[PDB]
Coordinates of C-alpha atoms in Angstrom, one line a residue:
Chain A
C289 CA 12.6 8.5 -10.6
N290 CA 8.9 9.0 -9.8
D291 CA 6.8 10.1 -6.7
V292 CA 6.6 6.4 -5.5
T293 CA 10.5 6.1 -5.3
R294 CA 10.8 9.6 -3.6
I295 CA 8.3 8.6 -0.8
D296 CA 10.0 5.2 -0.5
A297 CA 13.5 6.8 -0.3
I298 CA 12.3 9.1 2.6
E299 CA 10.6 6.2 4.5
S300 CA 13.8 3.9 4.1
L301 CA 16.2 6.7 5.0
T302 CA 13.9 7.8 7.9
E303 CA 13.7 4.1 9.2
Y304 CA 17.4 3.2 8.6
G305 CA 19.4 6.5 8.3
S306 CA 20.5 6.5 12.0
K307 CA 21.8 2.8 11.6
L308 CA 24.0 3.7 8.6
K309 CA 27.7 4.0 9.7
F310 CA 29.7 6.7 7.8
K311 CA 33.4 6.9 8.7
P312 CA 34.9 10.5 8.8
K313 CA 35.2 11.9 5.3
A314 CA 33.4 8.8 3.8
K315 CA 33.6 8.4 0.0
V316 CA 29.9 7.5 -1.0
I317 CA 28.8 6.0 -4.3
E318 CA 25.1 6.1 -5.3
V319 CA 23.4 4.2 -8.2
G320 CA 19.9 5.5 -9.0
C321 CA 18.3 7.7 -11.7
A322 CA 21.2 10.3 -12.1
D323 CA 18.1 12.7 -12.1
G324 CA 18.4 14.9 -8.9
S325 CA 15.3 14.0 -7.0
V326 CA 16.2 10.8 -4.9
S327 CA 19.9 11.8 -4.9
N328 CA 19.0 15.3 -3.4
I329 CA 16.9 13.5 -0.7
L330 CA 19.8 11.0 0.1
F331 CA 22.2 14.0 0.2
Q332 CA 20.2 15.5 3.1
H333 CA 20.7 12.2 5.2
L334 CA 24.5 12.0 4.7
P335 CA 27.0 13.3 7.3
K336 CA 28.1 16.9 6.6
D337 CA 31.7 15.6 6.8
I338 CA 31.5 13.1 3.8
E339 CA 34.5 13.4 1.3
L340 CA 32.4 12.8 -1.9
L341 CA 29.1 11.6 -3.2
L342 CA 29.7 10.0 -6.6
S343 CA 26.2 9.6 -8.2
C344 CA 26.2 7.1 -11.1
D345 CA 23.8 6.3 -14.0
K346 CA 23.8 3.8 -17.0
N347 CA 22.5 6.5 -19.4
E348 CA 25.5 8.5 -20.7
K349 CA 23.0 11.4 -21.6
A350 CA 21.5 11.5 -18.0
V351 CA 25.1 11.8 -16.6
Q352 CA 26.1 14.5 -19.2
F353 CA 22.9 16.5 -18.3
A354 CA 23.7 16.1 -14.5
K355 CA 27.3 17.5 -14.9
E356 CA 26.0 20.6 -16.8
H357 CA 22.7 21.1 -14.8
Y358 CA 23.0 19.8 -11.2
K359 CA 25.4 21.7 -8.9
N360 CA 26.4 20.7 -5.3
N361 CA 29.9 21.0 -3.7
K362 CA 30.2 17.3 -2.7
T363 CA 28.7 15.6 -5.8
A364 CA 30.2 14.1 -8.9
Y365 CA 28.3 12.2 -11.8
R366 CA 29.8 9.2 -13.6
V367 CA 28.5 6.7 -16.2
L368 CA 28.4 3.3 -14.5
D369 CA 26.6 0.1 -15.6
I370 CA 26.3 -1.8 -12.3
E371 CA 25.6 -5.0 -14.4
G372 CA 28.8 -4.3 -16.5
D373 CA 32.5 -4.2 -15.8
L374 CA 33.8 -1.9 -13.1
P375 CA 36.4 0.6 -14.4
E376 CA 39.7 0.0 -12.3
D377 CA 39.8 3.5 -10.7
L378 CA 36.5 2.9 -8.8
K379 CA 37.5 -0.6 -7.4
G380 CA 37.8 -0.7 -3.6
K381 CA 37.5 3.1 -3.3
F382 CA 34.1 3.6 -1.5
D383 CA 33.1 3.4 2.2
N384 CA 29.3 3.4 1.4
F385 CA 27.3 2.1 -1.5
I386 CA 23.6 3.3 -1.7
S387 CA 21.0 2.3 -4.3
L388 CA 17.4 3.2 -3.6
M389 CA 14.8 1.5 -5.8
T390 CA 17.0 0.6 -8.8
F391 CA 18.1 -3.1 -8.4
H392 CA 14.7 -4.7 -9.4
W393 CA 15.7 -3.5 -13.0
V394 CA 19.0 -5.5 -12.8
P395 CA 18.4 -9.1 -14.0
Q396 CA 22.0 -10.0 -13.3
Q397 CA 21.7 -9.8 -9.4
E398 CA 24.9 -11.7 -8.5
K399 CA 27.0 -9.7 -11.0
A400 CA 25.5 -6.4 -9.7
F401 CA 26.2 -7.4 -6.0
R402 CA 29.7 -8.6 -6.7
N403 CA 30.3 -5.1 -8.3
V404 CA 28.9 -3.6 -5.1
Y405 CA 31.4 -5.7 -3.1
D406 CA 34.3 -4.7 -5.5
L407 CA 33.4 -0.9 -5.3
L408 CA 33.6 -1.1 -1.5
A409 CA 36.8 -0.4 0.5
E410 CA 37.4 -2.7 3.6
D411 CA 34.6 -2.3 6.2
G412 CA 32.6 -0.6 3.4
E413 CA 28.8 -0.5 4.2
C414 CA 26.1 -1.4 1.5
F415 CA 22.5 0.0 1.7
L416 CA 20.0 -1.0 -1.1
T417 CA 16.2 -1.0 -1.6
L418 CA 14.4 -2.9 -4.4
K419 CA 10.9 -4.2 -5.3
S420 CA 9.9 -7.8 -5.2
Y421 CA 6.2 -8.5 -5.9
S422 CA 3.9 -5.5 -6.9
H423 CA 0.4 -4.9 -8.2
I424 CA 2.1 -2.8 -11.0
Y425 CA 4.1 -5.8 -12.1
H426 CA 0.9 -7.9 -11.7
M427 CA -1.0 -5.5 -14.1
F428 CA 1.7 -6.1 -16.7
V429 CA 1.5 -9.9 -16.1
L430 CA -2.3 -9.8 -16.7
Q431 CA -1.7 -7.7 -19.9
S432 CA 1.0 -10.3 -21.1
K433 CA -1.6 -13.1 -20.8
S434 CA -4.0 -11.4 -23.3
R435 CA -4.4 -13.0 -26.8
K436 CA -3.8 -9.5 -28.2
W437 CA -0.8 -8.2 -26.2
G438 CA 0.9 -11.5 -25.2
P439 CA 2.7 -11.8 -28.6
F440 CA 4.6 -8.4 -28.0
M441 CA 5.4 -9.3 -24.4
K442 CA 7.6 -12.4 -24.5
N443 CA 10.6 -11.0 -22.5
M444 CA 8.6 -10.4 -19.3
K445 CA 11.3 -12.0 -17.2
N446 CA 13.8 -9.1 -17.4
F447 CA 11.0 -6.4 -16.9
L448 CA 9.7 -8.1 -13.7
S449 CA 11.7 -7.9 -10.4
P450 CA 13.9 -11.0 -10.3
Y451 CA 12.0 -11.4 -6.9
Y452 CA 8.4 -10.9 -8.3
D453 CA 7.2 -14.5 -7.8
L454 CA 9.8 -16.0 -5.3
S455 CA 9.1 -17.2 -1.8
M456 CA 11.3 -15.5 0.8
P457 CA 13.1 -13.1 -1.6
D458 CA 14.9 -11.8 1.5
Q459 CA 16.6 -15.3 1.9
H460 CA 17.4 -15.5 -1.9
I461 CA 19.1 -12.1 -1.6
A462 CA 20.9 -13.0 1.7
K463 CA 22.3 -16.2 0.0
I464 CA 23.8 -14.1 -2.9
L465 CA 25.4 -11.6 -0.4
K466 CA 26.8 -14.6 1.6
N467 CA 28.2 -16.1 -1.7
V468 CA 29.7 -12.7 -2.8
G469 CA 31.5 -12.4 0.6
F470 CA 29.5 -9.8 2.6
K471 CA 29.2 -10.1 6.5
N472 CA 26.6 -8.6 8.9
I473 CA 23.9 -9.4 6.2
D474 CA 20.5 -7.9 7.2
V475 CA 17.8 -8.3 4.5
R476 CA 14.3 -7.0 5.6
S477 CA 11.1 -7.3 3.4
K478 CA 8.3 -4.7 3.7
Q479 CA 4.7 -4.6 2.6
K480 CA 4.0 -1.0 1.3
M481 CA 0.9 0.6 -0.1
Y482 CA 0.7 3.8 -2.2
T483 CA -2.4 5.8 -3.2
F484 CA -2.6 8.0 -6.3
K485 CA -5.2 10.8 -6.2
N486 CA -4.8 11.2 -10.1
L487 CA -5.5 8.4 -12.6
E488 CA -4.0 10.6 -15.5
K489 CA -0.7 11.0 -13.6
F490 CA -0.7 7.2 -13.0
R491 CA -1.4 6.6 -16.8
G492 CA 1.7 8.7 -17.7
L493 CA 3.9 6.6 -15.3
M494 CA 2.8 3.4 -17.0
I495 CA 3.6 4.9 -20.4
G496 CA 7.0 5.9 -19.0
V497 CA 8.0 2.5 -17.3
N498 CA 6.4 0.3 -20.1
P499 CA 9.3 -1.2 -22.1
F500 CA 7.0 -3.3 -24.5
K501 CA 6.9 -1.9 -28.2
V502 CA 3.6 -2.1 -30.0
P503 CA 2.5 -0.3 -33.2
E504 CA 2.1 3.5 -32.4
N505 CA -1.5 3.2 -33.8
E506 CA -2.4 0.3 -31.4
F507 CA -0.3 2.0 -28.6
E508 CA -3.4 3.8 -27.0
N509 CA -5.4 0.5 -27.0
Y510 CA -2.4 -1.1 -25.3
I511 CA -2.3 1.5 -22.5
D512 CA -6.2 1.4 -22.1
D513 CA -6.1 -2.4 -21.7
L514 CA -3.2 -1.9 -19.2
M515 CA -5.4 0.6 -17.2
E516 CA -8.2 -2.0 -17.4
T517 CA -5.9 -4.5 -15.6
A518 CA -6.1 -2.1 -12.5
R519 CA -9.9 -2.4 -12.7
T520 CA -9.6 -6.2 -13.0
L521 CA -7.4 -6.2 -9.8
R522 CA -10.1 -3.8 -8.3
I523 CA -7.4 -1.3 -7.1
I524 CA -9.1 1.7 -8.8
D525 CA -11.6 3.5 -6.6
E526 CA -13.8 4.9 -9.4
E527 CA -16.2 6.8 -7.0
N528 CA -13.2 9.0 -5.8
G529 CA -10.8 8.5 -8.8
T530 CA -7.9 6.9 -6.7
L531 CA -5.6 3.9 -7.3
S532 CA -4.3 2.1 -4.2
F533 CA -1.6 -0.5 -5.0
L534 CA 0.6 -2.8 -2.9
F535 CA 4.3 -3.4 -3.5
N536 CA 6.8 -5.5 -1.5
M537 CA 10.3 -4.4 -1.2
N538 CA 13.6 -5.5 0.3
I539 CA 16.1 -3.3 2.3
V540 CA 19.7 -4.7 2.1
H541 CA 22.1 -3.6 4.8
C542 CA 25.6 -5.2 5.0
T543 CA 29.4 -4.7 5.4
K544 CA 32.5 -5.7 3.5
Chain B
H191 CA -9.4 -21.0 11.4
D192 CA -7.9 -24.5 10.9
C193 CA -4.2 -25.5 10.2
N194 CA -3.4 -27.0 6.8
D195 CA -0.4 -27.6 4.5
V196 CA 0.3 -23.8 4.0
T197 CA 0.5 -23.1 7.8
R198 CA 2.5 -26.4 8.2
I199 CA 5.3 -25.1 5.8
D200 CA 5.1 -21.5 7.2
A201 CA 5.6 -23.0 10.8
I202 CA 8.7 -25.0 9.5
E203 CA 10.3 -21.9 7.7
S204 CA 9.5 -19.5 10.6
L205 CA 10.9 -21.8 13.4
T206 CA 14.0 -22.9 11.3
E207 CA 14.8 -19.2 10.7
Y208 CA 14.2 -18.2 14.4
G209 CA 15.2 -21.5 16.3
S210 CA 18.5 -19.8 17.3
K211 CA 16.9 -16.4 18.3
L212 CA 14.1 -18.2 20.4
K213 CA 15.3 -18.9 24.0
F214 CA 13.6 -21.3 26.5
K215 CA 14.6 -21.1 30.2
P216 CA 15.0 -24.4 32.2
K217 CA 11.6 -26.0 33.0
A218 CA 9.8 -23.4 30.8
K219 CA 6.0 -23.1 31.0
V220 CA 5.1 -22.7 27.3
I221 CA 1.6 -21.6 26.0
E222 CA 0.7 -22.2 22.4
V223 CA -2.5 -20.7 20.7
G224 CA -3.7 -22.2 17.4
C225 CA -5.0 -25.6 16.5
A226 CA -5.7 -28.3 19.1
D227 CA -4.6 -30.4 16.1
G228 CA -1.5 -32.1 17.6
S229 CA 0.9 -31.1 14.7
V230 CA 1.6 -28.1 16.9
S231 CA 3.7 -30.2 19.4
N232 CA 5.3 -32.3 16.6
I233 CA 6.9 -29.1 15.1
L234 CA 7.5 -27.3 18.5
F235 CA 9.2 -30.4 20.1
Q236 CA 11.9 -30.1 17.3
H237 CA 12.9 -26.7 19.1
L238 CA 11.6 -27.2 22.7
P239 CA 14.3 -28.5 25.0
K240 CA 13.6 -31.9 26.8
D241 CA 13.6 -29.9 30.1
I242 CA 10.3 -27.9 29.6
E243 CA 7.7 -28.3 32.4
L244 CA 4.5 -27.8 30.4
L245 CA 3.2 -27.1 26.9
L246 CA -0.4 -25.7 27.3
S247 CA -2.0 -25.9 23.8
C248 CA -5.1 -23.7 23.5
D249 CA -7.8 -23.3 20.9
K250 CA -11.1 -21.2 20.9
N251 CA -12.8 -24.5 19.6
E252 CA -14.1 -26.8 22.5
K253 CA -14.7 -29.7 20.1
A254 CA -11.0 -29.5 18.9
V255 CA -9.8 -29.4 22.6
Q256 CA -12.1 -32.4 23.6
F257 CA -10.6 -34.5 20.7
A258 CA -6.9 -33.6 21.7
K259 CA -7.7 -34.4 25.4
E260 CA -8.9 -37.9 24.4
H261 CA -6.3 -38.9 21.8
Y262 CA -3.0 -36.8 21.9
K263 CA -1.2 -37.3 25.3
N264 CA 2.4 -36.2 25.9
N265 CA 3.3 -36.1 29.7
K266 CA 4.2 -32.3 29.4
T267 CA 1.4 -31.3 27.0
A268 CA -2.1 -30.2 28.3
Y269 CA -5.0 -28.7 26.2
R270 CA -7.5 -25.9 27.2
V271 CA -10.2 -23.7 25.5
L272 CA -9.0 -20.0 25.3
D273 CA -10.2 -17.0 23.3
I274 CA -7.0 -14.8 23.0
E275 CA -9.4 -11.8 22.1
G276 CA -11.5 -12.5 25.3
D277 CA -10.8 -12.1 29.0
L278 CA -7.9 -14.2 30.4
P279 CA -8.7 -16.6 33.2
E280 CA -6.8 -15.4 36.5
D281 CA -5.1 -18.8 36.9
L282 CA -3.2 -18.3 33.5
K283 CA -2.0 -14.6 34.2
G284 CA 1.8 -14.3 34.5
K285 CA 2.3 -18.1 34.4
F286 CA 4.3 -18.5 31.1
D287 CA 7.9 -18.2 30.0
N288 CA 7.0 -18.6 26.3
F289 CA 3.9 -17.6 24.2
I290 CA 3.8 -19.1 20.7
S291 CA 1.1 -18.5 18.0
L292 CA 1.6 -19.6 14.4
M293 CA -0.7 -18.3 11.7
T294 CA -3.6 -17.5 14.0
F295 CA -3.5 -13.7 14.8
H296 CA -4.7 -12.6 11.4
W297 CA -8.1 -14.0 12.6
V298 CA -8.1 -11.5 15.6
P299 CA -9.6 -8.1 14.8
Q300 CA -8.8 -6.8 18.4
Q301 CA -5.0 -6.9 17.9
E302 CA -4.1 -4.6 20.9
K303 CA -6.4 -6.6 23.2
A304 CA -4.9 -9.9 22.0
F305 CA -1.3 -8.5 22.5
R306 CA -2.2 -7.2 26.0
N307 CA -3.5 -10.8 26.7
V308 CA -0.2 -12.2 25.4
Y309 CA 1.7 -9.7 27.7
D310 CA -0.5 -10.7 30.7
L311 CA 0.0 -14.4 30.0
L312 CA 3.8 -13.9 30.2
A313 CA 5.9 -14.2 33.4
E314 CA 8.7 -11.6 33.8
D315 CA 11.3 -11.8 30.9
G316 CA 8.8 -14.1 29.1
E317 CA 9.3 -14.3 25.3
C318 CA 6.5 -14.3 22.6
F319 CA 6.8 -15.7 19.0
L320 CA 3.9 -15.1 16.6
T321 CA 3.4 -15.3 12.8
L322 CA 0.4 -13.8 11.0
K323 CA -0.7 -12.9 7.4
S324 CA -1.0 -9.3 6.1
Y325 CA -1.9 -9.1 2.4
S326 CA -2.5 -12.3 0.4
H327 CA -3.9 -13.3 -3.0
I328 CA -6.4 -15.5 -1.1
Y329 CA -7.8 -12.4 0.8
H330 CA -7.7 -10.6 -2.6
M331 CA -9.9 -13.4 -4.2
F332 CA -12.5 -12.7 -1.5
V333 CA -12.1 -8.9 -2.1
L334 CA -12.8 -9.5 -5.8
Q335 CA -15.9 -11.7 -4.9
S336 CA -17.2 -8.9 -2.6
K337 CA -17.2 -6.3 -5.5
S338 CA -19.6 -8.4 -7.6
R339 CA -23.2 -7.0 -7.9
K340 CA -24.5 -10.6 -7.0
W341 CA -22.3 -11.6 -4.0
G342 CA -21.5 -8.1 -2.8
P343 CA -24.7 -7.9 -0.6
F344 CA -23.7 -11.0 1.5
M345 CA -20.2 -9.8 2.2
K346 CA -20.4 -6.4 3.8
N347 CA -18.6 -7.6 7.1
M348 CA -15.2 -8.2 5.3
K349 CA -13.1 -6.2 7.7
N350 CA -13.2 -8.9 10.5
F351 CA -12.4 -11.6 7.8
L352 CA -9.4 -9.8 6.2
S353 CA -6.1 -9.7 8.2
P354 CA -6.1 -6.3 10.0
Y355 CA -2.9 -5.7 7.9
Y356 CA -4.4 -6.7 4.6
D357 CA -4.3 -3.1 3.1
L358 CA -1.8 -1.3 5.5
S359 CA 1.6 0.2 4.5
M360 CA 4.4 -1.2 6.7
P361 CA 2.3 -3.6 8.8
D362 CA 5.6 -4.5 10.7
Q363 CA 5.7 -0.8 12.0
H364 CA 2.0 -0.9 13.0
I365 CA 2.5 -4.2 14.9
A366 CA 5.7 -2.9 16.6
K367 CA 3.9 0.3 17.7
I368 CA 1.1 -1.9 19.3
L369 CA 3.7 -4.0 21.1
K370 CA 5.7 -0.9 22.4
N371 CA 2.4 0.7 23.8
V372 CA 1.4 -2.6 25.7
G373 CA 5.0 -2.6 27.2
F374 CA 7.0 -5.3 25.2
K375 CA 10.8 -5.0 25.0
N376 CA 13.3 -6.2 22.4
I377 CA 10.6 -5.8 19.7
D378 CA 11.6 -7.6 16.4
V379 CA 8.8 -7.5 13.7
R380 CA 9.9 -8.8 10.2
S381 CA 7.6 -9.1 7.2
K382 CA 8.2 -11.8 4.5
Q383 CA 6.8 -12.4 1.0
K384 CA 5.8 -16.1 0.7
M385 CA 4.6 -18.2 -2.2
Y386 CA 2.7 -21.5 -2.1
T387 CA 1.6 -23.9 -4.9
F388 CA -1.4 -26.3 -4.8
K389 CA -1.1 -29.2 -7.3
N390 CA -4.8 -30.2 -6.6
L391 CA -7.6 -27.6 -7.3
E392 CA -10.3 -29.9 -5.6
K393 CA -8.2 -29.7 -2.3
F394 CA -7.9 -25.9 -2.9
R395 CA -11.7 -25.5 -3.5
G396 CA -12.4 -27.5 -0.3
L397 CA -10.1 -25.2 1.7
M398 CA -12.0 -22.1 0.5
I399 CA -15.3 -23.7 1.6
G400 CA -13.7 -24.4 5.0
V401 CA -12.5 -20.7 5.4
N402 CA -15.5 -18.9 3.8
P403 CA -17.4 -17.2 6.7
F404 CA -19.9 -15.4 4.3
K405 CA -23.5 -16.7 4.4
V406 CA -25.2 -17.0 1.0
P407 CA -28.6 -18.7 0.2
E408 CA -27.9 -22.5 0.5
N409 CA -29.2 -23.1 -3.1
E410 CA -26.6 -20.4 -4.5
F411 CA -23.6 -21.9 -2.5
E412 CA -22.1 -23.9 -5.5
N413 CA -22.5 -20.7 -7.8
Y414 CA -20.8 -18.7 -4.9
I415 CA -17.8 -21.1 -4.7
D416 CA -17.7 -21.4 -8.6
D417 CA -17.3 -17.5 -8.8
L418 CA -14.8 -17.6 -5.9
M419 CA -12.6 -20.1 -7.9
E420 CA -13.1 -17.8 -10.9
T421 CA -11.4 -14.9 -9.1
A422 CA -8.2 -17.1 -9.0
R423 CA -8.5 -17.2 -12.9
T424 CA -9.0 -13.4 -12.9
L425 CA -5.8 -12.9 -10.9
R426 CA -4.2 -15.4 -13.4
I427 CA -2.7 -17.5 -10.5
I428 CA -4.1 -20.9 -11.8
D429 CA -1.9 -22.8 -14.3
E430 CA -4.8 -24.4 -16.3
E431 CA -2.7 -27.1 -18.2
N432 CA -0.8 -28.3 -15.0
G433 CA -3.9 -27.9 -12.7
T434 CA -1.8 -25.8 -10.2
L435 CA -2.5 -22.5 -8.2
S436 CA 0.5 -20.4 -7.1
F437 CA -0.5 -17.7 -4.6
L438 CA 1.5 -15.0 -2.8
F439 CA 1.0 -14.1 0.9
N440 CA 2.8 -11.6 3.1
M441 CA 3.4 -12.5 6.7
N442 CA 4.8 -11.0 9.8
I443 CA 7.0 -12.6 12.4
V444 CA 6.8 -11.2 15.9
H445 CA 9.6 -11.8 18.5
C446 CA 9.6 -9.8 21.7
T447 CA 10.2 -9.9 25.5
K448 CA 8.4 -8.9 28.7

């Protein structure tokens, strides 16, 4: 999680929270960064009556830290790989699935959504947010097209949102939900803008999210060239040291 | 402002998605704002019932309205000059069951005024349906051009050229707030990400010359467009070997009632 996903979570739960149906003593599963931040925000928006909030992560370590560190009455952590195979004891057991700003990382969209379907009890409600196009993704695309860095950046496809360069990603997503068997499918796209006051904070976030391995000597030249893509896109305000970037995102709301 | 293959395909996509949500009363008076270019009626008549009384098709452009008057005659279609940003003529106020505007309103800086004019055109329970751009790679190209030391000086009035929603977070929520204040009901504003590919960069260049409002010295005009085309290369949206240009644009779909 980072400050962008925190603000996005608050805006999406603010906008939609009152339209999310929770049955009495709902069992709720969350897939995000097991890290507390976004899960703590989501918790504040859930009914005080909910049976359980199972908060799941792919990283065994992150889950193990969560069990030993984070402490709330209604919250359990479990290792779950939304792209993988569902363990049998989670199948059909949840009234609400929630994933805020995670699914743009999942290249196997249909597999992940069929697992959302299979985790849900009957009349189970699905609420997901994900990126499509973004200026951050676009920075990385510009970098990938350099004579110097292109060689180390051949698997761009799985780093980018599956919806990065599609027309009507909302209709692509609606089609998969339809095929997997959801009803009352609502997919809304949003243009969002976010402004950093701190270019050094922004620089750390790129370092964090960057998956492309380069020699640890050439690493700092790699990052500097990546920051220069933001200047190429003219999204840096040098006079005030701010970066204003656009991202599109998709809010999925549907029922089993 | 002139309709083209991008707006042609956005009209089809928008009307096919919303053709079921869009309602037309018997003998509907419909007003349409965009191009006097007759392709308006040819797409609308795929969704308009045979019953309608009138399609009034307006443009700010007298010359376009003259041409349509002379050449394109359906019994039920009439054409008229109208600036949606300006003051409504009294004979059009409260006369319309449907207001339709595709890919025009991003050219309107005075959004609230234009939306009040839409509201004042509509009879009671009238419906409106509009589409407009927010952010696009085309706008961004012009933004890149405006930052150059050379072309910057001729391009200080960008705000009126950019969509009012070019740089806003959640343009859908801004639009829906304006509509609520003016007094619309059943407000539905949906944003979409769209992509379009040109297979002909000479066609594309010609569209840019068409849409450029910025006045440079006449003997630097070719250098100006050359650098504009170059911003497409800078964004890396030109496929050099195939001779194609794939650009992203966000748009907004407005559906609401009076």
